[PDB]
């Protein structure tokens, strides 16, 4: 943990099934759901090095 | 580099005496100089920073002083620790020198 | 990514595009923030008594 | 000169110690407290809700007298009912925040006794120098 | 006994008249939904039940 | 990845948008200050089998 | 308050590379630089400062005579910091240190351990 | 239980007794002083005015030399120019609105002594403090 | 402000004396010349290099004052 006093720079976007411009992940690609077990709700996925 | 010159080289007086020692610098160095203590068998530990700013701990009767390019060291009574070797020094910028170095002695 | 609906066991999954509320597009970002507040009272057990 | 960098004694990364060391950095916290057309009305809310928490905690200390200093010693005894344990243990094994989270239930009282002592002190105190 | 020296209260209750901005307060039944009407918008803090006198 | 959770032994497939508006059955962006609605049907058109 | 130890080899011949390792603390501070120093005493005769480094850098400075066998490493998920030296000689037989000195508002307080032995033969 | 009732000590309601009794109770008066589109904007303003109005009087008290008590005494001497009476009727048989409507005139000058007598206090004690 | 002067243990008075001693480094001078022909504007402009060096002496002495009394206190 550490603390800090102000965040780091946000560009806000607009888009929709995909995202643009964006921070990327280091380790590997990576999965983050809420209850992933149930297909209710949506699934994030990060990736590891950006396409153009 | 500046060359910074001890005096003297070797001395010998008895306990309780009162004695001093100085360091001449090659040139004007204003006074961001300070003076290191050390014993045989030991890592060496500052003595005085900056020859007008007492070390905490240290005992009072060394007083120290001086500017340019002289800085002296006065001891008003010599104990049987004060028999120890010193080094004056210059934290100016960049390289760094030492002193030559003295010893005192019993006599 | 959403997850389609299955039934028992297919042992095959399928997911399709999803999005449409722009509060994910911003989830995606500060998930690595938290704020919180300041308490400064305090007590403890000592050995003293008040001054008389 | 060259070489010397700069130290500083900053914000709350002093507290995952015991309580004998954080006690020495005390004072920094305590100074961090008052520092300083839609949006505008919010921001000034903030500030006056600030402002209000400072003298609300600025008159609970008043109340019990030990005002104007940083540590202050009272009069009421510490019921073994709370807990137990001993001194040297609370004194060099536990952090703030285990204490608080264990002296949760029991907070209300022990500011009524405090109360108490203290009113019960200066009345006391009033009536003797009434005597004198 | 007969000189004496000034000696200052506090708190002491003594009042006088004057005038000042009143403010609102309506019952948190009326906040229950009727989110339609003039009067009674949701500014108003909520009230406190058992008034005393 | 993905197929820690689920066992190994499955068959993973993607398909386009199911359908809707068509603000959400089509990636839309902008550039330039111009707003643009593309068709990606021909990027979630896949299958993988085990092995 | 920070304590600090010395790792390296006993006897290394000469023309060989030695490497020197020394860790360190950050002791009740909570932020800011600490211009950690490398410095040498062959056995009758005045010191010489070898070389340093700050704790939130990578340009280690090196002085003029020693540039060209000299290199300083630090790593900081081990805390520690490490001097490669080649082509060993026997002047290099010396006492060795690695030290410290705070910043705080005008002390200018230093620590220096114990420092480590080291002897050049064949 | 079935006789049993409540009998609590409330606001200002002691303004009908002799100018000693109301002494006795006074602390909790003290202890009710900074209790905490355009349908909500005066409450901004009434903030304001209260936290302003409490601060005055911190103030004003400060200044005097007696702060943190709730009954202080000083050096300044009574003058019968000022008013009569003694303290056996004073004490006995009257009430605090009509002390302040009894003596509203001379009002400042009391105030004005106050300080000018802590300043020679004071300066007094320096030297008597630095004479060593 | 009133909040630092309440930090350096003096509240509720004009005055106040503290336990650091005065270096001579920032200014020699001596106490006929200071106390009696100086004005404050002049003096403030003279001694306006060193303030935060100065207050945190107060702050430090203050506090292991106040640590320092606390043992004796709690020895009783
Ligand atoms: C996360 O999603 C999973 C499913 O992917 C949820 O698990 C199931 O949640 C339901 C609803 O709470 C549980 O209730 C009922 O259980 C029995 C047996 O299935 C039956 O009466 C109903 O069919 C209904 O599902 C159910 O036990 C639970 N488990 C299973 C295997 O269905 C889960 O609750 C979701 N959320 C969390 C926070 O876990
Ligand atoms: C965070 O936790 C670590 C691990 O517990 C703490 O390190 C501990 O620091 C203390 C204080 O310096 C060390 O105690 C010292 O060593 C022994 C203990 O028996 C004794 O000679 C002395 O009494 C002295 O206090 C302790 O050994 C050390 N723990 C270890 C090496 O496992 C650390 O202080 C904590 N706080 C931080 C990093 O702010
Ligand atoms: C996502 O993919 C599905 C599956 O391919 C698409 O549905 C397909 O849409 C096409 C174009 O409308 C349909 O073609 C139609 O076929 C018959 C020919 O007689 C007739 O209805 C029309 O003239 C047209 O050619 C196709 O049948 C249909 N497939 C299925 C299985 O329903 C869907 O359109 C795609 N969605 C998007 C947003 O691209
Ligand atoms: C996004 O583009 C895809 C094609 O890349 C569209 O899906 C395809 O739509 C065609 C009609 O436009 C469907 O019918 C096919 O047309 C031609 C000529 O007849 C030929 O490819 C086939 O014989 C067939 O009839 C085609 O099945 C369909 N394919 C799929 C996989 O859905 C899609 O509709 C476009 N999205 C939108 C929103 O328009
Ligand atoms: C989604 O993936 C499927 C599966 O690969 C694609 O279906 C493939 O579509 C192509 C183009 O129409 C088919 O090629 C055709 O094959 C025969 C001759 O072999 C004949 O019908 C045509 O002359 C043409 O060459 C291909 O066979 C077909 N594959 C399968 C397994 O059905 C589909 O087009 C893909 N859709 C998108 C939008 O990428
Ligand atoms: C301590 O608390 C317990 C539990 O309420 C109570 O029975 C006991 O009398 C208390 N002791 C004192 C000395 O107040
Ligand atoms: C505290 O109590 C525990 C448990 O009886 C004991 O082991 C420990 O030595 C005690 N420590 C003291 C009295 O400092
Ligand atoms: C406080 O009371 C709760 C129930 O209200 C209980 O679960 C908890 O253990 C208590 N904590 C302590 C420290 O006594
Ligand atoms: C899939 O294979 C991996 C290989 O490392 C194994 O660890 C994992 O348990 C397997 N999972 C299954 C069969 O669900
Ligand atoms: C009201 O006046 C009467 C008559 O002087 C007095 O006895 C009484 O205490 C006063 N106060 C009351 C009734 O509260
Ligand atoms: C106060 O003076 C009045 C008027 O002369 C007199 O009646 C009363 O007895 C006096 N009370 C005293 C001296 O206590
Ligand atoms: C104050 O003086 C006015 C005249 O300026 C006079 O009418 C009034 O009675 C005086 N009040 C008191 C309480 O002496
Ligand atoms: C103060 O020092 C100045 C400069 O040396 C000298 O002229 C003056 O007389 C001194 N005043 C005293 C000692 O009162
Ligand atoms: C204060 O510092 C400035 C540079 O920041 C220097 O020019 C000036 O002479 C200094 N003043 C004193 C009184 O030392």
Same mark, same amino acid.
């Given at each position: 943990?550490?603390?800090?006093?102000?965040?780091?720079?946000? @560009?806000?976007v607009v888009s929709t099934q995909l995202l643009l411009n964006g921070?990327?992940?280091?380790?590997?690609?990576?999965?983050? +759901?809420?209850?992933?077990?149930?297909?209710?709700? =949506?699934?994030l996925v990060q990736f590891?090095?950006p396409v153009q | 580099?500046?060359?910074?010159?001890?005096?003297?080289?070797?001395?010998?007086?008895?306990?309780?005496?009162?004695?001093?020692?100085?360091?001449?610098?090659?040139?004007?160095?204003?006074?961001?100089?300070?003076?290191?203590?050390?014993?045989?068998?030991?890592?060496?530990?500052?003595?005085?920073?900056?020859?007008?700013?007492?070390?905490?701990?240290?005992?009072?009767?060394?007083?120290?002083? !001086?500017?340019?390019?002289?800085?002296? *060291?006065?001891?008003?009574?010599?104990?049987?620790?004060?028999?120890?070797?010193?080094?004056?020094?210059?934290?100016?910028?960049?390289?760094?020198?030492?002193?030559?170095?003295?010893?005192?002695?019993?006599? | 990514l959403?997850?389609?609906?299955?039934?028992?066991?297919?042992?095959?999954?399928?997911?399709?595009p999803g999005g449409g509320?722009?509060?994910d597009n911003?989830?995606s970002?500060?998930?690595?923030? @938290?704020?919180? @507040?300041?308490?400064?009272?305090?007590?403890?057990?000592?050995?003293?008594?008040?001054?008389? | 000169?060259?070489?010397? !960098?700069?130290?500083? %004694?900053?914000?709350?990364?002093?507290?995952?110690?015991?309580?004998?060391?954080?006690?020495?950095?005390?004072?920094?916290?305590?100074?961090?407290?008052?520092?300083?057309?839609?949006?505008?009305?919010?921001?000034?809310?903030?500030?006056?809700?600030?402002?209000?928490?400072?003298?609300?905690?600025?008159?609970?200390?008043?109340?019990?007298?030990?005002?104007?200093? %940083?540590?202050?010693?009272?009069?009421?005894?510490?019921?073994?009912?709370?807990?137990?344990?001993?001194?040297?243990?609370?004194?060099?094994?536990?952090?703030?925040?285990?204490?608080?989270?264990?002296?949760?239930?029991?907070?209300?009282?022990?500011?009524?006794?405090?109360?108490?002592?203290?009113?019960?002190?200066? @009345?006391?105190?009033?009536?003797?120098?009434?005597?004198? | 006994?007969?000189?004496?020296?000034?000696?200052?209260?506090?708190?002491?209750?003594?009042?006088?008249?004057?005038?000042?901005?009143?403010?609102?307060?309506?019952?948190?039944?009326?906040?229950?939904?009727?989110?339609?009407?003039?009067?009674?918008?949701?500014?108003?803090?909520?009230?406190?039940? =058992?008034?005393?006198? | 990845?993905?197929?820690?959770?689920? !066992?190994?032994?499955?068959?993973?497939?993607?398909?386009?948008s199911?359908?809707?508006?068509?603000?959400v059955?089509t990636h839309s962006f902008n550039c330039?200050?111009?707003?643009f609605y593309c068709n990606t049907?021909?990027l979630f058109?896949?299958?993988?089998?085990?092995? | 308050?920070?304590?600090?130890?010395?790792?390296?080899?006993?006897?290394?011949?000469?023309?060989?590379?030695?490497?020197?390792?020394?860790?360190?603390?950050?002791?009740?501070? +909570? !932020?800011?630089?600490?211009?950690?120093?490398?410095?040498?005493?062959?056995?009758?005769?005045? *010191?010489?400062?070898?070389?340093?480094?700050?704790?939130?850098?990578?340009?280690?400075?090196? =002085?003029?005579? %020693?540039?060209?066998?000299?290199?300083? +490493?630090?790593?900081?998920?081990?805390?520690?910091?490490?001097?490669?030296?080649?082509?060993?000689?026997?002047?290099?037989?010396?006492?060795?240190?690695?030290?410290?000195?705070?910043?705080?508002?005008?002390?200018?307080?230093?620590?220096?351990?114990?420092?480590?032995?080291?002897?050049?033969?064949?």
């Open positions: 943990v550490s603390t800090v006093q102000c965040t780091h720079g946000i @560009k806000p921070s990327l992940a280091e380790e590997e690609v990576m999965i983050r +759901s809420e209850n992933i077990t149930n297909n209710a709700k =949506n699934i590891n090095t | 580099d500046i060359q910074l010159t001890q005096s003297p080289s070797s001395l010998s007086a008895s306990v309780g005496d009162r004695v001093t020692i100085t360091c001449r610098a090659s040139q004007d160095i204003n006074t961001d100089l300070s003076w290191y203590y050390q014993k045989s068998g030991e890592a060496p530990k500052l003595l005085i920073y900056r020859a007008s700013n007492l070390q905490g701990g240290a005992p009072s009767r060394f007083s120290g002083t !001086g500017s340019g390019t002289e800085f002296t *060291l006065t001891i008003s009574s010599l104990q049987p620790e004060d028999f120890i070797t010193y080094y004056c020094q210059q934290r100016y910028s960049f390289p760094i020198t030492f002193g030559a170095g003295t010893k005192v002695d019993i006599k | 959403t997850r389609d609906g299955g039934s028992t066991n297919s042992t095959t999954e399928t997911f399709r509320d722009m509060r911003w989830r970002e500060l998930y690595k923030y @938290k704020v919180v @507040k300041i308490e400064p009272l305090g007590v403890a057990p000592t050995r003293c008594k008040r001054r008389v | 000169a060259v070489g010397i !960098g700069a130290v500083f %004694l900053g914000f709350l990364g002093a507290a995952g110690s015991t309580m004998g060391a954080a006690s020495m950095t005390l004072t920094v916290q305590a100074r961090n407290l008052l520092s300083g057309t839609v949006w505008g009305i919010k921001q000034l809310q903030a500030r006056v809700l600030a402002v209000e928490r400072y003298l609300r905690d600025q008159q609970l200390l008043g109340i019990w007298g030990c005002s104007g200093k %940083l540590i202050c010693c009272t009069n009421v005894p510490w019921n073994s009912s709370w807990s137990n344990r001993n001194l040297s243990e609370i004194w060099d094994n536990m952090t703030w925040l285990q204490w608080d989270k264990e002296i949760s239930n029991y907070t209300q009282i022990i500011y009524g006794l405090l109360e108490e002592s203290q009113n019960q002190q200066e @009345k006391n105190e009033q009536d003797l120098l009434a005597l004198d | 006994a007969e000189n004496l020296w000034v000696t200052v209260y506090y708190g002491v209750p003594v009042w006088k008249d004057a005038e000042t901005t009143l403010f609102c307060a309506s019952d948190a039944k009326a906040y229950e939904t009727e989110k339609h009407n003039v009067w009674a918008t949701h500014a108003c803090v909520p009230t406190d039940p =058992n008034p005393q006198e | 990845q993905l197929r820690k959770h689920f !066992g190994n032994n499955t068959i993973i497939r993607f398909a386009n199911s359908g809707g508006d068509l603000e059955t330039g200050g111009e707003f049907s021909g058109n896949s299958t993988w089998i085990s092995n | 308050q920070v304590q600090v130890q010395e790792s390296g080899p006993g006897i290394v011949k000469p023309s060989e590379t030695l490497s020197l390792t020394c860790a360190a603390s950050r002791g009740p501070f +909570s !932020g800011g630089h600490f211009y950690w120093n490398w410095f040498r005493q062959p056995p009758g005769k005045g *010191l010489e400062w070898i070389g340093g480094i700050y704790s939130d850098g990578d340009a280690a400075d090196y =002085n003029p005579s %020693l540039e060209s066998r000299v290199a300083i +490493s630090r790593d900081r998920s081990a805390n520690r910091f490490s001097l490669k030296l080649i082509s060993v000689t026997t002047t290099d037989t010396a006492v060795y240190y690695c030290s410290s000195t705070y910043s705080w508002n005008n002390v200018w307080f230093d620590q220096w351990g114990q420092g480590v032995l080291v002897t050049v033969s064949s």
